[PDB]
Amino acid sequence: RFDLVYLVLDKVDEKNDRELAKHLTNLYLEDVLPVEFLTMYISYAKEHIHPIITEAAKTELVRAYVGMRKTATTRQLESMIRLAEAHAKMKLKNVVELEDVQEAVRLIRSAIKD
Amino acid sequence: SVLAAANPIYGRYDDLKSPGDNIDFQTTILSRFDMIFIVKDDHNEERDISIANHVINIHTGNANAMQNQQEENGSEISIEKMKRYITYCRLKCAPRLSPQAAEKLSSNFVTIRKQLLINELESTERSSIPITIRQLEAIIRITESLAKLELSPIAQERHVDEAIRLFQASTMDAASQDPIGGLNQASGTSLSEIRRFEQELKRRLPIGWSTSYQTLRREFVDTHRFSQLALDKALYALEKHETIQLRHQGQNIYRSGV
Amino acid sequence: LEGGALVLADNGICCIDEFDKMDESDRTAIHEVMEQQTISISKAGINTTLNARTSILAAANPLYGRYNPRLSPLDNINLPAALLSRFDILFLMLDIPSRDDDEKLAEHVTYVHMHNKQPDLDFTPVEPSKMREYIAYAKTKRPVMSEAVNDYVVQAYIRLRQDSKREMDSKFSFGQATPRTLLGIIRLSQALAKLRLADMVDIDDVEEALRLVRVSKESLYQ
Amino acid sequence: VRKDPITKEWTLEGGALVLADKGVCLIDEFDKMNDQDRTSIHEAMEQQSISISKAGIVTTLQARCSIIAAANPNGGRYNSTLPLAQNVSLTEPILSR
Amino acid sequence: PSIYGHDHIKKAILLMLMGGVEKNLENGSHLRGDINILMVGDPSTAKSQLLRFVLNTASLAIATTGRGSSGVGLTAAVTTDRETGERRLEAGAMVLADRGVVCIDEFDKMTDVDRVAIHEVMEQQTVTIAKAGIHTTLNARCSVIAAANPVFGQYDVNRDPHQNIALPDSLLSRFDLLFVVTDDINEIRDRSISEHVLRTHRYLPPGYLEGEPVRERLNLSLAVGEDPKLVTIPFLRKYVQYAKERVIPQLTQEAINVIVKNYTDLRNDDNTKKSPITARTLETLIRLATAHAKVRLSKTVNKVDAKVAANLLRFALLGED
DNA sequence: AAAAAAAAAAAAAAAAAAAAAAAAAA
DNA sequence: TTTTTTTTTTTTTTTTTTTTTTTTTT
Numbered sequence A: 001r002f003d004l005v006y007l008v009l010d011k012v013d014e015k016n017d018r019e020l021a022k023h024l025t026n027l028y029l030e031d032v033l034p035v036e037f038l039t040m041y042i043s044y045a046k047e048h049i050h051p052i053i054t055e056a057a058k059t060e061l062v063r064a065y066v067g068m069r070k071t072a073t074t075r076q077l078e079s080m081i082r083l084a085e086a087h088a089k090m091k092l093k094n095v096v097e098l099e100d101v102q103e104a105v106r107l108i109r110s111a112i113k114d
Numbered sequence B: 001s002v003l004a005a006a007n008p009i010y011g012r013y014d015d016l017k018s019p020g021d022n023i024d025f026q027t028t029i030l031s032r033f034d035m036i037f038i039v040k041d042d043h044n045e046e047r048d049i050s051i052a053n054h055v056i057n058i059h060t061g062n063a064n065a066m067q068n069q070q071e072e073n074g075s076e077i078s079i080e081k082m083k084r085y086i087t088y089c090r091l092k093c094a095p096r097l098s099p100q101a102a103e104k105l106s107s108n109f110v111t112i113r114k115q116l117l118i119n120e121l122e123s124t125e126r127s128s129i130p131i132t133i134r135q136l137e138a139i140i141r142i143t144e145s146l147a148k149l150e151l152s153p154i155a156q157e158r159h160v161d162e163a164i165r166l167f168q169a170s171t172m173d174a175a176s177q178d179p180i181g182g183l184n185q186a187s188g189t190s191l192s193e194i195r196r197f198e199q200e201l202k203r204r205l206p207i208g209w210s211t212s213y214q215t216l217r218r219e220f221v222d223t224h225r226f227s228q229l230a231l232d233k234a235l236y237a238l239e240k241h242e243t244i245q246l247r248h249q250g251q252n253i254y255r256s257g258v
Numbered sequence C: 001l002e003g004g005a006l007v008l009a010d011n012g013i014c015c016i017d018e019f020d021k022m023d024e025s026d027r028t029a030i031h032e033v034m035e036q037q038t039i040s041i042s043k044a045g046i047n048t049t050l051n052a053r054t055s056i057l058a059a060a061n062p063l064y065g066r067y068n069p070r071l072s073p074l075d076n077i078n079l080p081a082a083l084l085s086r087f088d089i090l091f092l093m094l095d096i097p098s099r100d101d102d103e104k105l106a107e108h109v110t111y112v113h114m115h116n117k118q119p120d121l122d123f124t125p126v127e128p129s130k131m132r133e134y135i136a137y138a139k140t141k142r143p144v145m146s147e148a149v150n151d152y153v154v155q156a157y158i159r160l161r162q163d164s165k166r167e168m169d170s171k172f173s174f175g176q177a178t179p180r181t182l183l184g185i186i187r188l189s190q191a192l193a194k195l196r197l198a199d200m201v202d203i204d205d206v207e208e209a210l211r212l213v214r215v216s217k218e219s220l221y222q
Numbered sequence D: 001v002r003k004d005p006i007t008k009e010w011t012l013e014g015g016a017l018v019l020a021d022k023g024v025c026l027i028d029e030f031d032k033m034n035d036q037d038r039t040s041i042h043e044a045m046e047q048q049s050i051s052i053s054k055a056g057i058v059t060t061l062q063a064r065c066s067i068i069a070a071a072n073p074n075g076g077r078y079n080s081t082l083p084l085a086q087n088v089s090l091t092e093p094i095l096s097r
Numbered sequence E: 001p002s003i004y005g006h007d008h009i010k011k012a013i014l015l016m017l018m019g020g021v022e023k024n025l026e027n028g029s030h031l032r033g034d035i036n037i038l039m040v041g042d043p044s045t046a047k048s049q050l051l052r053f054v055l056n057t058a059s060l061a062i063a064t065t066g067r068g069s070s071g072v073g074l075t076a077a078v079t080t081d082r083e084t085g086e087r088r089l090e091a092g093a094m095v096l097a098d099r100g101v102v103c104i105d106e107f108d109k110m111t112d113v114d115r116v117a118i119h120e121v122m123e124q125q126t127v128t129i130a131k132a133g134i135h136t137t138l139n140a141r142c143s144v145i146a147a148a149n150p151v152f153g154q155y156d157v158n159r160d161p162h163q164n165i166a167l168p169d170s171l172l173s174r175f176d177l178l179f180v181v182t183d184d185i186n187e188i189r190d191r192s193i194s195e196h197v198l199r200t201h202r203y204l205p206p207g208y209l210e211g212e213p214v215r216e217r218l219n220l221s222l223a224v225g226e227d228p229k230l231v232t233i234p235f236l237r238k239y240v241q242y243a244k245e246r247v248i249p250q251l252t253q254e255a256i257n258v259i260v261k262n263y264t265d266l267r268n269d270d271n272t273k274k275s276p277i278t279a280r281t282l283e284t285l286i287r288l289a290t291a292h293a294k295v296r297l298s299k300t301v302n303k304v305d306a307k308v309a310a311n312l313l314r315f316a317l318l319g320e321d
Numbered sequence F: 001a002a003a004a005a006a007a008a009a010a011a012a013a014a015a016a017a018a019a020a021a022a023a024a025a026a
Numbered sequence G: 001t002t003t004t005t006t007t008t009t010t011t012t013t014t015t016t017t018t019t020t021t022t023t024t025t026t
Ligand SMILES: Nc1ncnc2c1ncn2[C@@H]1O[C@H](COP(=O)(O)OP(=O)(O)OP(=O)(O)O)[C@@H](O)[C@H]1O
Pocket: B028, B031, B133, B134, B137, E002, E003, E004, E005, E042, E043, E044, E045, E046, E047, E048, E049, E050, E149, E197
């Protein structure tokens, strides 16, 4: 019943281990990030904005679900719709289009990859 | 004093299984009981008819019409009279043993404690009913209790014999369950040697005529077939009511049937 | 509002004896302190968070007696793996019978009983007030690090991880190394630098810290 | 056994077998029952009395009650090719009563 | 004198009666001078008839049973003083026996919540009370003799010792001498012990006739005036009192030499003992040597004391007798 | 001014016994 | 799987005493 499930993996890789240790030590070494803009943007998007769905989302969503059914339960499509409509709330809009559904399906299939 | 009653596991004693699998009381509690009675039903017809008549007389009213008479004449006393006798005896007398009573009790303790060793060595498992020093003190107490009845100031061999017999009836009988067969590690070779010896004995001795334990030992052991446990094999064959009979003070072994 | 012992010792040491028998209710607090060091308070309508920065010194008792040729250290004690991972250092002191050591131990113990004074030796007992004075003065000191020193730490950590990938064996070692091990390496180098040195930390300080950690790790067999 | 709210002394309170003195106690689904609860009626079924020794109270009550019980066989259904002892879980001490 | 055998346990009880010398050490510490004995054995082995004797012969003794005791009943209980009105503390079994002995029977049948408290008293010899605004430390310096039974009805030699005893290891480490006693069937032993028991059961108090019940009532005459060789019990009591109050022996080097060699020999051997050997065995040797030195009415610990202590502990741990 | 009557003042609490649930295992 | 194990949860106040100090009441 969880909408997204992520698996975090830790493999012994020389590149990854060195890169992690490098920035950890750099943080310990003493020498584009908004502070509170996120809270206000989140409140604005959550309290005023309500997107809708158009047939452009219909055409992509139905065929994407069918292609995923070429063991995807019906929960999967209602998960794609929620993610697409949440992406539509971002990059402030008032309606969904192809970009939002593409991002949603990419996210939910990268989740499947793990 | 403690008087206790209980049932075994599974309800009935189930003489087919081991005594250790039938009594759930540990050795710690069972050593504090002077007398233990294991009660079983034998399902005999004569006893069943006697008990049925006795019980029907109770229900039909014929009980009282008899009992008063005996309570009148010389054979029974009322509850109150027996209560007063008990309190008088307990508040008046406290007997003591005699030198010969101690000698007779020590030998009985040695005998009943030796027997347990042979039983435990044969069954290669510890006894569920234990025999300890408390079992000697119990027999001493029973002897003095028997002496107390007659208001006697000394306990003698007459009371010692009855106390010993009561102990044999109560606790030694429970300890000596004598399992016919448990199919355990003990007598493991006997699981086949019993049938082997039975066949060898029934082919040697036809349905008539007799033999002796002396010969059945010497000749059947010269071939090194002795097991030291053939004492009860003859009795087990006797239990079949056909294979073996013992006569003439146990010397003569008679073949009686198939 | 009554604070606990964990809260009571701020910038101090909490000595938890018989940690095996202590209940999961306290295990929750032990888990949370090592994570954030800020104790959340009871639900009696106050909603209070209290500072609890403290260091932990735990003494353990292995399950059912002594060390067991059971290979897993997790089998020796009840403590979860996650709880043990947060600990900076683990020390196993197993009692192995050796004919030489017993003689000196018995002599040392019996000298104290014959004469109440401890056995005189070339070793000099430093005066305890000097102990406290030096410890406090070291605590007040604030080290600092350099970019060159921490570069060798990366090589040390990658060597340790490349060992740990094959270090997974039947008996020795506890799981695999984690970035928390790298963090604890620097954390232990802090104290060894504060001990006598100041300003930038020496390179040999990291070697000393690594040696102490490695001896503690090798204590699993011993 | 309960503590009296007023007197504050341990006292005895009734039960199902005592509420049905000179009556009938009915026990549906008598085989789907704990053994410790089932064994409590052994004294009441035959001796028609209840004995309590708890918290300084040593008393004997009276329960002249009749029991009609209903049960299900093992497997939910009766095998007519088997004897009774292998169609039920109850032992002899409770079957005799 | 009414117990047949158990010579080594009777020696251990005597060494308990004359305790060791307590050493007060820096950091606010004290090395305990009490000897604690545990007896595990088979049913009907005269374990409970020695605790009763210790109750009578000792100067101070408190009796306890496992199942009929509680933690608040052993350490202390918060009560009220009716006459004046304050709230106060009432002593329990352990603290009432300060400089005395506590005899516990059915020790294994005690509940776990009950068994933790006795642990602390066995370790620190002090009780901590922090209830109802009464924050106090109470002194309890008592010697513990205990009797228990194995997990099964009887001791099993085919199973490891820890399986036979249900007690935890932490509790078991706090006893100086653990005696495992077993009843073995042998005809000569039975003939001797039965004779002894039958001789005991034929004793008549002076002034009583045969068959006369004992009148243990005194007829309300409470008092008349209101204020091989064996020794009589009051003389033994005087001896124990005099030894405890008049001699304080000190350890010597030549005894230490024997103690260290015994400890080193015992530690490094493959014999399977009924209890593990640890660094606290040396303290047990020292305490037993001090007690034996007190028995001799001497102010120094000699080699013979070390030999006797070594023999006693070898019998206890190994049974090599 | 001198009698008879009528309330305040409580406080206190741990320590043990019995019964029903919600987690552990031969 | 049915056995043992385990926490745990209200259980509490109904009573006291004679002074000492207040209001009514002839
Ligand atoms: N060696 C002995 N000498 C004399 N009497 C003995 C001896 N051993 C046992 N007894 C007798 O056995 C009886 C029971 O002994 P006791 O009560 O001391 O046993 P126990 O070890 O406490 O038993 P339990 O395990 O049942 O608690 C007493 O009458 C006691 O006199």
